[PDB]
Symmetry: C2
């Protein structure tokens, strides 16, 4: 058995956290990993016997102590929110893992309101990728946080070309219609939709939604939707 | 109306690049963006009239010059590979784009060295996500670059638990079979497959391939395959 303690932990930024691991396997080697999206398992620190600690691939912000054969601790002296993760102890000669410790390091004042300034200047598109058969209505969506945005242009971009204006709406309206192209604009929800009716293969392109403050003179772009219209 | 020059450029990490944009719209504002996977369009520098330049969201490593109404230049004094991208000039008062300029920055001797050194210690899994119906044979794939790796365990990990060893092969062998679980291992090609025959819902899990040098004592993990076996 490899047993970890605690199994869930919440801490505050700047706090100190210690994670404990106990093994009964009688193994010389122990390991601390964390598990994150996009990263798999990254080795933080390890130990090849009692009294010894070795920095792993990602040591910074952590220390370790192997006081005895059975015990390997992981010490976060100044917890940061980047330390939020699932942490796994393992013992080996042929490698056995604990059950995991979920750690949540909370943000600041500073963090929470900087992370609100952040969002408020973003335009968010969904989906990133949209595949429809020809004849479906393809529906692309955009959302924004600034109430001062009043003009909403959409751009259409074909491979090896620059974006070209497709269709726009001013916040005074709830609907703009031009051929196969309709904008629906919900000012209370701060949410816009572009409907391409009777979709054709030749409408396959990257679609960008922007949000322009017509007074403060600044242009904010969504990251885009890749549209694929299949015959 | 908005024309860039050149349209394709290749340069060397030492060098200096200048991108030119010429507009005919008689517009006061001009903009330089780059386009990258994941980032959408990001504004590097802009200009609100002849003689004026303003840093955008991502100015570091670029300069800009607005010598006249018509002309807006983008200068990379010390081109890094991070500056490889498609660059778009736009003019405005309502925003028009050029056609784009593909810039490729190579890639020194130290770099290509460092970059082969990093792959060589890496284990690669494909695909990140695999969905099959129950009864299909789920095939998960792995590959490595170091010839010294000779022991290849697989781990199976269920939600809210640690990885547990599933099945392993030694490089002396080309096939290991245990129940529903087969490893096929190609030493010449350095490629390894796990086959789950007669797959069932309860096989849904994250599967890790690892490569272990039994001599040099290091565990290298792949990033994982999330398997979904649908009833």
């Amino acid at each position: 058995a490899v047993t970890q303690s605690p199994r869930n932990k919440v801490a505050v930024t700047g706090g100190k956290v210690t994670l404990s691991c106990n093994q009964t396997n009688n193994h010389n080697n122990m390991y601390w990993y964390r598990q994150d999206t996009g990263h798999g398992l990254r080795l933080i620190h390890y130990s090849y016997g009692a009294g010894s600690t070795e920095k792993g691939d990602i040591p910074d912000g952590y220390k370790a102590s192997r006081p005895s054969q059975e015990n390997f601790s992981l010490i976060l002296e100044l917890a940061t929110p980047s330390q939020t993760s699932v942490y796994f102890c393992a013992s080996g000669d042929r490698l056995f893992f604990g059950h995991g410790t979920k750690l949540s390091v909370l943000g600041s004042a500073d963090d929470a309101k900087k992370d609100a300034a952040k969002k408020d200047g973003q335009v968010r598109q969904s989906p990133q990728s949209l595949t429809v058969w020809e004849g479906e209505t393809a529906i692309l969506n955009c959302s924004y946080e600034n109430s001062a945005f009043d003009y909403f242009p959409w751009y259409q971009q074909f491979p090896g070309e620059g974006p070209a204006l497709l269709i726009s709406i001013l916040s005074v309206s709830d609907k703009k219609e031009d051929g196969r192209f309709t904008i629906f604009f919900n000012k209370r929800e701060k949410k816009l939709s572009l409907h391409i009716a009777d979709s054709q293969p030749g409408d396959s392109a990257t679609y960008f939604c922007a949000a322009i403050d017509t007074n403060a003179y600044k242009v904010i772009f969504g990251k885009g939707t890749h549209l694929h219209v299949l015959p």
